[PDB]
Amino acid sequence: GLFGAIAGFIEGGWTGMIDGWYGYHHQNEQGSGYAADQKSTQNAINGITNKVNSVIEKMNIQFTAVGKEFNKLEKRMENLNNKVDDGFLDIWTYNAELLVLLENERTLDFHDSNVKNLYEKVKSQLKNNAKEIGNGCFEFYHKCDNECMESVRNGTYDYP
Amino acid sequence: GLFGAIAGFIEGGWTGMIDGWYGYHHQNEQGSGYAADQKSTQNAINGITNKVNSVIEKMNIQFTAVGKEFNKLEKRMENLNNKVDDGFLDIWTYNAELLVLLENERTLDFHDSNVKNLYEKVKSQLKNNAKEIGNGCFEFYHKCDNECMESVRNGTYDYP
Amino acid sequence: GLFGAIAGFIEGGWTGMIDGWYGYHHQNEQGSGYAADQKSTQNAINGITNKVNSVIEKMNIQFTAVGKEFNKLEKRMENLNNKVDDGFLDIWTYNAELLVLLENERTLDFHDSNVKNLYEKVKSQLKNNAKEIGNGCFEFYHKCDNECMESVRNGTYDYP
Amino acid sequence: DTICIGYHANNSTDTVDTVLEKNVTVTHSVNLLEDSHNGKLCRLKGIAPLQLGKCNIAGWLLGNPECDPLLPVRSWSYIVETPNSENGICYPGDFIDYEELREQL
Amino acid sequence: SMHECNTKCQTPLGAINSSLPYQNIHPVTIGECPKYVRSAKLRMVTGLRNIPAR
């Protein structure tokens, strides 16, 4: 997208992750499988939950709103009431649709950001222990276990 | 801007580019020329055309807005009318200048994004065969044709 | 945050940096201390000053607004006046609380971007003659004085 | 021993509209807009409304003979008319400040 | 038609029983209802772009 991970250098998303929005497809000689990164997943979920809260909280509830009737010699104050009800309804519908286009784009920017921050975090651990091969896929120089994969997940693996 | 490619690592834009918004310039033994990267330029043109359509679509065309007279013992209802007309015109003028400043910033950030996405796809493609010089320029280690420069435009390029 | 420097790759800010929002720590043999990057600090201050100006100057000052009087057979034009005042105040509080939460996040993204644009600028100058160590820190290969360390700050030091 | 960073996908045919592209297919979304209703008049917090039915406000308040079923109604949470609320004033003239009387009520 | 249902929000078409911020049913409301707007879709994304790789 904007940052260049979602349909970017990482070609597509994997249905093998269900545990979280971000994850690692490990391909060990001890067996392959998927494992979600709980940190980037929960930071994204917390930021999305606060965005979902914020847009609903700013929408203070509509109380009893009823139509006003006017007589045959009150057509001006009828057209003032009509202009007021229409003009408010225009502004509320306009702000509701404008914000939706903006926040959907900003959320796709935010998720693309969270894949990028996770990729560079794993790349800075696999420095001269691996090479980049598949745009997300690293290929190790010394072949390490599922414990060493989990060490790369949890933010350790200090190896050169 | 917000991605450090436009006015950043690439010092300025090329006036010899007319074919598209993002493009390359080869310096082969076959000579030189400006050639746009079509996929990034067209995707940006779709993103700009959709925003241009959206901001024009979201306002609905102003129907007949006619001024209303009030007599000498209706000056309260004139001050209600005037407050309604002013207060709507305030809000609609504020909404128009809000979305102009905000989306003009987002447009320059979006184009700056697309130029770094253009540079990073070429860096990940040329890899061990080329180094950085002018920040954007890639001296090859083997010297390949303008057909092989087109292989970097379409993003194939079959040599590590 | 979004760009992944502020609470990202750089773990925390320095309380010895006070002179600017961006800068460098000395760790040479000529002693420790701090020297601010005035270009990243001033471009951030200019963007912040223009957004501070924008949010204030768009809000054109409120003229005299007083309560209006209505008798016992004017409850409709009283409740129409009240609906106009309440509906404008709903929209006004809504636009103010939209702008403050959105542009505080965009300010965090903008500052986080200015740390990227500075760090990648120093990496492209240092290259092989210094390597990254303390996620922000660069260990000089050949070693050099506070004059050579200053030359990296001001936008020179074009050493491979 | 290889390790590949990626992002989530699923079977979800949810779509959203953005400034860049309309109807973008997404893994999860929620609607902030409401369209469902019971199709029924219901009690507002356990208290039933007054339904004027075949009558309007003026036929109930003056006590028109066709609006005698509405005369014992003491309390309500809201007042309801229908498109056929014609039993009002049953002898011609005018109702002075009618518009204000339904605003009081 | 009147029925022995209960609600926090009524409209002329029928009673809404939801906590969503907006509605598109009717401008006339009684009690504590969602905000009337002429919108047909205000769907916000919580996940990312679905690209199944299938």
XYZ file of C-alpha atoms in Angstrom:
639
model
C 0.000 0.000 0.000
C 1.537 3.332 1.172
C 4.644 1.886 2.930
C 4.930 -1.043 0.428
C 4.302 -4.360 2.342
C 0.530 -5.089 1.884
C 0.482 -6.250 -1.799
C 4.066 -4.819 -1.886
C 7.303 -6.871 -1.591
C 5.345 -9.462 0.478
C 3.196 -10.823 -2.395
C 0.054 -11.907 -0.488
C -1.392 -12.661 2.954
C -1.526 -16.230 4.317
C -4.695 -17.976 5.560
C -2.323 -20.185 7.673
C -2.318 -17.275 10.192
C -5.619 -17.129 12.127
C -3.941 -16.370 15.547
C -3.073 -12.745 14.546
C -2.856 -10.087 11.780
C 0.988 -10.447 11.524
C 3.039 -13.642 11.675
C 5.977 -15.799 10.673
C 5.835 -18.846 8.397
C 8.763 -20.888 9.773
C 10.168 -23.538 7.395
C 12.401 -25.709 9.629
C 13.964 -29.102 8.895
C 12.049 -29.960 12.143
C 8.803 -29.075 10.211
C 7.012 -26.048 8.668
C 4.127 -24.044 10.207
C 2.655 -20.574 10.925
C 3.010 -18.598 14.195
C 1.557 -15.085 14.744
C 3.603 -12.231 16.269
C 1.527 -11.390 19.381
C 3.270 -7.961 19.818
C 2.510 -6.360 16.385
C -0.939 -8.086 16.375
C -1.963 -6.722 19.821
C -0.482 -3.199 19.159
C -2.592 -3.126 15.946
C -5.709 -4.448 17.811
C -5.295 -1.827 20.640
C -4.879 0.996 18.055
C -7.944 -0.293 16.083
C -10.045 -0.685 19.291
C -9.186 2.942 20.294
C -10.123 4.114 16.717
C -13.453 2.154 16.943
C -14.072 3.704 20.420
C -13.069 7.261 19.278
C -15.448 7.419 16.236
C -18.424 6.063 18.321
C -17.647 8.231 21.456
C -17.527 11.492 19.392
C -21.047 10.540 18.158
C -23.129 11.797 21.140
C -26.641 10.177 21.041
C -29.610 11.709 19.099
C -32.499 12.513 21.502
C -36.248 12.936 20.617
C -36.480 14.839 17.293
C -40.036 15.455 16.010
C -41.492 17.360 13.031
C -42.855 20.878 13.666
C -46.223 21.810 12.084
C -46.987 25.381 10.906
C -50.210 27.027 9.582
C -50.977 28.475 6.086
C -49.559 31.940 7.114
C -46.301 30.427 8.542
C -44.682 29.174 5.270
C -41.469 31.217 5.953
C -40.851 29.659 9.425
C -41.680 26.249 7.819
C -38.991 26.851 5.113
C -36.577 28.031 7.900
C -37.259 24.744 9.805
C -36.802 22.771 6.522
C -33.516 24.680 5.758
C -32.275 23.984 9.349
C -33.181 20.224 9.309
C -31.817 19.701 5.731
C -28.642 21.820 6.300
C -27.729 19.887 9.517
C -28.524 16.531 7.810
C -26.233 17.520 4.851
C -23.333 18.345 7.259
C -23.760 15.144 9.394
C -23.983 12.883 6.274
C -20.991 14.751 4.686
C -18.737 14.423 7.804
C -19.798 10.729 8.213
C -18.813 9.785 4.609
C -15.645 12.043 4.461
C -14.216 10.583 7.709
C -14.962 6.978 6.506
C -12.836 7.417 3.301
C -10.001 9.080 5.319
C -9.912 6.620 8.299
C -10.094 3.492 6.023
C -7.028 4.805 4.108
C -5.187 5.789 7.378
C -5.946 2.286 8.823
C -4.482 0.545 5.696
C -1.428 2.902 6.061
C -1.248 1.885 9.781
C -1.368 -1.889 9.064
C 1.243 -1.559 6.224
C 3.423 0.309 8.804
C 3.023 -2.589 11.336
C 4.261 -5.186 8.733
C 7.268 -2.876 7.940
C 8.186 -2.343 11.647
C 8.014 -6.169 12.131
C 10.100 -6.965 8.992
C 12.963 -4.538 9.905
C 12.888 -5.870 13.529
C 13.525 -9.454 12.248
C 16.070 -8.239 9.588
C 18.179 -6.477 12.309
C 18.510 -9.874 14.136
C 19.367 -11.992 11.008
C 22.211 -9.575 9.922
C 25.152 -11.840 8.877
C 23.435 -15.105 9.989
C 21.117 -14.991 6.910
C 20.368 -13.463 3.494
C 17.016 -12.153 2.154
C 15.648 -14.540 -0.560
C 11.831 -14.218 -1.057
C 10.911 -10.622 0.091
C 10.010 -11.565 3.682
C 11.811 -14.984 3.533
C 15.287 -15.229 5.116
C 17.645 -18.197 4.467
C 20.059 -18.983 7.351
C 23.838 -19.648 7.043
C 24.157 -22.140 9.979
C 20.623 -23.778 10.210
C 18.987 -23.233 13.673
C 16.028 -24.955 15.454
C 12.420 -23.978 16.452
C 13.893 -22.595 19.760
C 16.093 -20.242 17.661
C 12.993 -19.360 15.536
C 11.106 -18.488 18.785
C 14.150 -16.389 19.888
C 13.667 -14.375 16.618
C 9.878 -14.050 17.445
C 10.297 -12.802 21.079
C 12.849 -10.047 20.153
C 16.155 -11.826 21.104
C 18.647 -13.657 18.727
C 21.615 -11.267 19.266
C 23.857 -13.381 16.903
C 26.223 -11.593 14.372
C 8.199 15.380 2.167
C 7.120 12.565 4.570
C 9.180 9.764 2.833
C 12.450 11.620 1.991
C 12.567 10.775 -1.789
C 10.899 13.889 -3.311
C 13.166 16.849 -2.321
C 15.226 14.238 -0.356
C 17.568 11.480 -1.693
C 16.590 12.438 -5.284
C 17.526 16.167 -5.336
C 14.972 17.290 -7.966
C 12.546 16.083 -10.646
C 13.441 15.780 -14.347
C 11.783 18.117 -16.896
C 12.769 15.594 -19.652
C 10.142 13.226 -18.121
C 6.730 13.986 -19.706
C 5.431 10.353 -20.149
C 4.650 9.864 -16.404
C 5.084 11.064 -12.780
C 7.768 8.435 -11.885
C 10.411 7.167 -14.309
C 13.989 6.198 -14.958
C 16.933 7.519 -16.946
C 19.448 4.996 -18.364
C 23.058 5.803 -19.404
C 23.856 2.733 -21.600
C 26.393 2.393 -24.437
C 23.097 2.445 -26.471
C 22.662 6.092 -25.258
C 20.245 7.831 -22.852
C 16.547 8.738 -22.538
C 13.728 9.315 -20.010
C 11.274 6.379 -19.741
C 8.339 6.343 -17.266
C 7.581 3.356 -14.998
C 3.952 2.865 -16.112
C 2.544 0.700 -13.243
C 3.465 3.148 -10.405
C 2.397 6.245 -12.447
C -1.004 4.743 -13.486
C -1.719 3.456 -9.910
C -0.987 7.005 -8.620
C -3.227 8.515 -11.375
C -6.065 6.122 -10.254
C -5.537 7.155 -6.574
C -5.557 10.882 -7.535
C -8.578 10.452 -9.917
C -10.572 8.639 -7.147
C -9.841 11.429 -4.554
C -10.659 14.138 -7.197
C -13.986 12.360 -7.955
C -14.719 11.780 -4.198
C -14.367 15.452 -3.020
C -16.582 16.624 -5.970
C -19.151 13.766 -5.392
C -19.584 14.312 -1.602
C -21.079 17.814 -1.987
C -24.579 17.724 -3.535
C -25.417 20.564 -5.993
C -26.862 23.747 -4.345
C -30.558 24.146 -5.274
C -32.468 27.519 -5.208
C -31.395 29.519 -2.105
C -33.642 32.613 -2.007
C -33.545 35.442 0.582
C -36.570 35.982 2.870
C -38.011 39.378 3.897
C -39.236 40.018 7.480
C -41.200 43.132 8.646
C -40.387 45.711 11.403
C -41.935 43.438 14.142
C -40.135 40.245 12.933
C -36.470 41.312 13.523
C -35.957 38.310 15.896
C -36.899 35.909 13.023
C -34.528 37.858 10.695
C -31.731 37.374 13.321
C -32.649 33.610 13.453
C -32.518 33.489 9.594
C -29.190 35.432 9.475
C -27.633 33.255 12.283
C -28.671 30.066 10.372
C -27.300 31.353 6.991
C -24.016 32.644 8.556
C -23.455 29.546 10.788
C -23.937 27.086 7.848
C -21.695 29.225 5.569
C -19.010 29.333 8.360
C -19.030 25.498 8.728
C -19.042 24.856 4.920
C -16.164 27.366 4.364
C -14.209 25.692 7.247
C -14.856 22.152 5.801
C -13.633 23.321 2.336
C -10.326 24.873 3.597
C -9.793 21.917 6.068
C -9.925 19.259 3.292
C -7.818 21.481 0.941
C -4.846 21.839 3.406
C -5.132 18.237 4.790
C -5.502 16.410 1.429
C -2.824 18.602 -0.324
C -0.346 17.478 2.391
C -1.503 13.803 1.970
C -1.078 14.158 -1.866
C 2.605 15.260 -1.610
C 3.196 12.498 1.018
C 1.505 9.947 -1.353
C 3.729 10.919 -4.343
C 6.860 10.885 -2.091
C 5.742 7.363 -0.973
C 5.463 6.229 -4.654
C 9.030 7.494 -5.484
C 10.575 5.534 -2.526
C 8.476 2.459 -3.614
C 9.990 2.950 -7.127
C 13.571 3.150 -5.709
C 13.260 0.187 -3.249
C 11.814 -2.175 -5.952
C 14.903 -1.387 -8.130
C 17.321 -1.804 -5.134
C 15.836 -5.235 -4.228
C 15.983 -6.195 -7.967
C 19.537 -5.036 -8.940
C 20.981 -6.266 -5.560
C 24.689 -7.395 -5.688
C 25.182 -6.162 -9.334
C 24.889 -2.415 -8.462
C 25.875 0.299 -5.947
C 24.520 3.802 -5.122
C 26.179 6.974 -6.526
C 23.810 9.975 -7.008
C 21.151 8.376 -4.651
C 18.839 6.896 -7.294
C 21.641 5.993 -9.812
C 22.788 2.335 -10.108
C 26.169 1.577 -11.799
C 26.010 -2.037 -13.083
C 28.977 -4.451 -12.569
C 28.402 -6.305 -15.918
C 26.935 -3.633 -18.347
C 23.520 -4.827 -19.705
C 21.419 -3.487 -22.659
C 18.405 -1.089 -22.892
C 16.347 -4.353 -23.143
C 17.812 -5.159 -19.672
C 16.916 -1.572 -18.517
C 13.331 -2.397 -19.672
C 13.672 -5.652 -17.620
C 14.114 -3.345 -14.536
C 11.033 -1.227 -15.599
C 8.748 -4.328 -15.828
C 10.696 -5.750 -12.807
C 11.897 -9.172 -14.173
C 15.802 -8.840 -14.478
C 17.143 -12.453 -14.289
C 20.666 -12.014 -12.759
C 21.698 -11.789 -9.008
C 5.242 4.914 16.046
C 4.168 4.751 12.344
C 7.691 5.358 10.916
C 9.285 3.188 13.660
C 11.988 5.479 15.211
C 10.214 7.267 18.134
C 9.855 4.390 20.679
C 10.862 2.165 17.682
C 14.499 1.434 16.646
C 15.691 4.311 18.931
C 14.421 3.096 22.351
C 14.074 6.540 24.014
C 14.892 10.254 23.730
C 17.825 11.943 25.500
C 17.339 14.558 28.268
C 20.862 15.825 27.324
C 19.263 16.833 23.961
C 17.462 20.114 24.830
C 18.834 22.472 22.069
C 16.749 20.788 19.302
C 14.153 18.016 18.719
C 16.773 15.985 16.732
C 20.511 15.646 17.237
C 23.599 13.593 17.931
C 25.498 12.251 20.958
C 29.318 12.486 21.062
C 31.098 9.219 22.029
C 34.602 10.040 20.622
C 37.955 10.076 22.536
C 37.584 13.925 22.806
C 34.744 13.285 25.355
C 30.930 12.926 25.467
C 28.245 15.644 25.118
C 25.452 16.546 22.629
C 25.301 18.522 19.346
C 21.853 19.239 17.832
C 20.892 18.725 14.158
C 19.502 22.200 13.375
C 18.125 21.276 9.872
C 15.786 18.455 11.122
C 14.863 20.585 14.193
C 14.064 23.725 12.117
C 12.050 21.909 9.347
C 10.003 20.223 12.134
C 9.541 23.641 13.872
C 8.405 25.227 10.521
C 5.849 22.403 9.920
C 4.655 22.681 13.573
C 4.456 26.533 13.393
C 2.384 26.371 10.141
C -0.038 23.707 11.575
C -0.336 25.716 14.871
C -1.092 28.859 12.754
C -3.560 26.896 10.508
C -5.647 25.439 13.411
C -5.898 28.923 15.093
C -6.365 31.227 12.015
C -9.078 29.035 10.333
C -11.211 29.712 13.451
C -12.469 33.266 12.654
C -13.393 35.073 15.944
C -16.943 34.832 17.478
C -18.921 38.119 17.436
C -21.647 39.024 20.045
C -24.124 36.124 20.481
C -26.847 36.768 23.104
C -29.991 34.929 24.283
C -33.283 35.720 22.489
C -36.660 36.296 24.196
C -39.930 34.414 23.502
C -43.432 34.727 25.097
C -45.876 31.916 26.130
C -47.235 31.585 22.498
C -43.687 31.491 20.957
C -42.484 28.041 22.210
C -42.010 26.820 18.578
C -39.560 29.642 17.624
C -37.870 29.143 21.068
C -37.367 25.379 20.397
C -36.275 26.212 16.782
C -33.697 28.716 18.202
C -32.557 26.063 20.754
C -32.330 23.317 18.027
C -30.198 25.724 15.898
C -27.837 26.568 18.847
C -27.547 22.899 20.035
C -27.115 21.493 16.470
C -24.348 24.067 15.674
C -22.633 23.309 19.048
C -22.812 19.506 18.347
C -21.135 20.058 14.918
C -18.603 22.561 16.398
C -17.504 20.293 19.301
C -17.409 17.341 16.816
C -15.138 19.186 14.289
C -12.820 20.378 17.142
C -12.446 16.858 18.684
C -11.954 15.311 15.171
C -9.166 17.840 14.325
C -7.297 17.516 17.679
C -7.096 13.643 17.740
C -6.296 13.346 13.969
C -3.623 16.104 13.835
C -1.937 14.953 17.119
C -1.432 11.513 15.469
C -0.216 13.209 12.201
C 2.238 15.315 14.327
C 3.646 12.095 15.924
C 3.926 10.523 12.391
C 5.617 13.730 11.069
C 8.237 13.833 13.876
C 8.821 10.030 13.607
C 9.415 10.568 9.822
C 12.021 13.330 10.563
C 14.077 10.815 12.676
C 14.025 8.340 9.674
C 15.100 11.093 7.196
C 18.031 11.993 9.535
C 19.180 8.400 10.371
C 19.125 7.154 6.724
C 20.979 10.406 5.723
C 23.831 9.597 8.184
C 23.885 5.880 7.097
C 24.288 6.928 3.401
C 27.256 9.195 4.407
C 29.024 6.699 6.740
C 28.592 3.522 4.563
C 31.589 1.171 5.301
C 33.684 3.722 7.315
C 31.137 3.314 10.159
C 28.706 0.455 11.015
C 25.459 0.585 13.068
C 25.774 -0.757 16.671
C 23.514 0.813 19.381
C 20.334 1.209 17.171
C 21.044 4.895 16.495
C 24.810 4.655 17.291
C 27.502 4.184 14.592
C 30.967 2.737 15.403
C 33.626 4.438 13.189
C 35.848 1.883 11.358
C 39.064 3.936 10.870
C 38.260 6.252 13.898
C 38.196 10.096 13.624
C 38.105 13.406 15.585
C 35.243 15.751 16.654
C 35.876 17.761 13.395
C 35.176 14.599 11.306
C 32.190 13.846 13.618
C 30.918 17.454 12.994
C 31.375 16.932 9.198
C 28.741 14.093 9.363
C 26.280 16.557 11.085
C 26.505 19.460 8.559
C 25.781 17.240 5.478
C 29.401 16.510 4.334
C 31.587 13.376 5.056
C 31.201 11.618 1.656
C 33.567 8.731 2.604
C 32.907 5.098 1.356
C 15.622 -23.565 8.092
C 13.987 -20.443 6.556
C 11.735 -17.798 8.229
C 9.199 -15.730 6.221
C 7.480 -12.555 7.549
C 3.904 -12.128 6.236
C 0.437 -10.775 7.106
C -3.036 -12.333 7.633
C -5.701 -13.307 5.108
C -8.994 -15.283 5.217
C -12.264 -16.007 3.300
C -13.833 -12.612 4.341
C -15.601 -10.811 1.443
C -16.036 -7.579 3.536
C -15.439 -4.343 1.551
C -14.732 -0.674 2.409
C -14.441 2.558 0.366
C -11.298 4.763 0.565
C -10.002 8.019 -1.056
C -7.625 5.896 -3.263
C -9.899 2.925 -4.200
C -13.606 1.996 -3.756
C -14.811 -1.480 -2.547
C -11.365 -2.739 -1.334
C -11.686 -6.368 -0.065
C -10.666 -6.555 3.647
C -10.157 -9.305 6.288
C -12.347 -7.648 9.003
C -14.706 -4.622 9.181
C -17.778 -3.330 11.092
C -20.708 -1.097 10.018
C -21.316 2.119 12.037
C -24.667 2.585 10.168
C -27.949 1.034 11.415
C -30.811 -0.122 9.131
C -32.717 -2.671 11.321
C -35.947 -1.832 13.176
C -38.735 -4.006 14.687
C -41.383 -2.736 12.156
C -43.586 -2.121 15.272
C -44.532 0.653 17.688
C -43.090 -0.441 21.073
C -43.125 0.795 24.701
C -40.515 3.518 25.410
C -38.882 2.184 28.642
C -41.869 -0.014 29.701
C -44.436 2.844 29.191
C -46.840 2.597 26.201
C -47.537 5.605 23.883
C -50.885 7.267 23.249
C -52.161 6.227 19.783
C -54.710 8.839 18.582
C -55.603 6.489 15.646
C -58.571 7.774 13.552
C -58.414 11.097 15.539
C -55.906 13.964 15.870
C -54.853 16.240 18.806
C -57.855 18.659 18.461
C -60.542 15.888 18.489
C -59.050 14.360 21.687
C -58.591 17.757 23.478
C -62.090 19.151 22.609
C -63.578 15.666 23.320
C -65.167 15.002 19.835
C -67.733 12.081 20.098
C -65.669 9.979 17.598
C -62.633 10.351 19.986
C -64.339 9.124 23.244
C -61.929 6.060 23.451
C -59.052 8.605 23.942
C -60.740 10.599 26.798
C -59.669 8.188 29.673
C -55.936 8.231 28.581
C -54.052 9.782 31.546
C -50.355 9.181 30.681
C -47.939 8.333 27.828
C -44.213 8.238 26.904
C -44.878 9.743 23.409
C -47.921 10.676 21.259
C -48.679 9.017 17.890
C -51.000 9.954 14.996
C -51.635 8.103 11.702
C -52.001 9.307 8.024
C -55.823 9.044 8.609
C -56.084 11.237 11.757
C -59.148 13.132 10.366
C -61.496 13.169 13.458
C -60.477 16.578 14.874
C -62.757 19.629 14.979
C -66.320 18.327 14.302
C -67.931 21.792 13.720
C -66.222 24.331 11.332
C -64.249 27.425 12.361
C -60.605 27.686 13.487
C -58.451 26.566 16.433
C -56.530 29.644 17.665
C -52.842 28.871 18.478
C -53.188 25.125 17.522
C -49.491 24.969 16.484
C -48.465 26.188 19.978
C -50.968 23.818 21.758
C -49.450 20.622 20.241
C -45.992 22.168 21.121
C -47.135 22.527 24.808
C -48.431 18.909 24.710
C -48.810 -1.175 14.644
C -48.569 -1.121 18.486
C -47.235 -4.308 20.155
C -46.044 -5.495 23.618
C -42.358 -4.982 22.683
C -40.007 -2.643 24.629
C -37.294 -0.283 23.290
C -34.955 2.686 24.007
C -35.520 4.158 20.469
C -38.674 4.517 18.339
C -39.129 5.744 14.740
C -42.361 6.000 12.578
C -41.301 2.828 10.640
C -40.497 0.780 13.792
C -38.330 0.518 16.941
C -34.496 0.427 16.650
C -32.653 -1.714 19.249
C -28.948 -1.049 18.505
C -25.867 0.755 19.936
C -24.360 1.819 16.517
C -23.705 5.632 16.254
C -25.578 6.314 12.930
C -28.936 5.237 11.381
C -30.635 5.711 7.958
C -34.249 4.650 8.760
C -36.121 7.922 9.626
C -35.246 11.548 10.710
C -38.175 11.565 13.200
C -37.116 9.812 16.434
C -38.320 9.328 20.037
C -36.064 8.442 23.023
C -32.292 7.821 22.631
C -31.653 6.863 18.966
C -28.618 6.782 16.571
C -27.954 9.898 14.385
C -30.033 10.099 11.181
C -27.903 10.352 8.006
C -28.756 9.753 4.305
C -25.732 7.332 4.017
C -26.118 3.738 2.676
C -22.688 2.441 3.916
C -20.478 3.719 6.797
C -18.350 0.545 7.038
C -14.999 1.109 8.810
C -12.160 -1.437 8.437
C -10.771 -3.132 11.591
C -8.515 -5.680 9.755
C -6.135 -5.263 6.770
C -6.626 -5.816 2.976
C -7.619 -9.478 2.316
C -5.261 -11.024 -0.257
C -5.814 -14.841 0.272
C -2.905 -15.853 -2.088
C -5.234 -18.707 -3.355
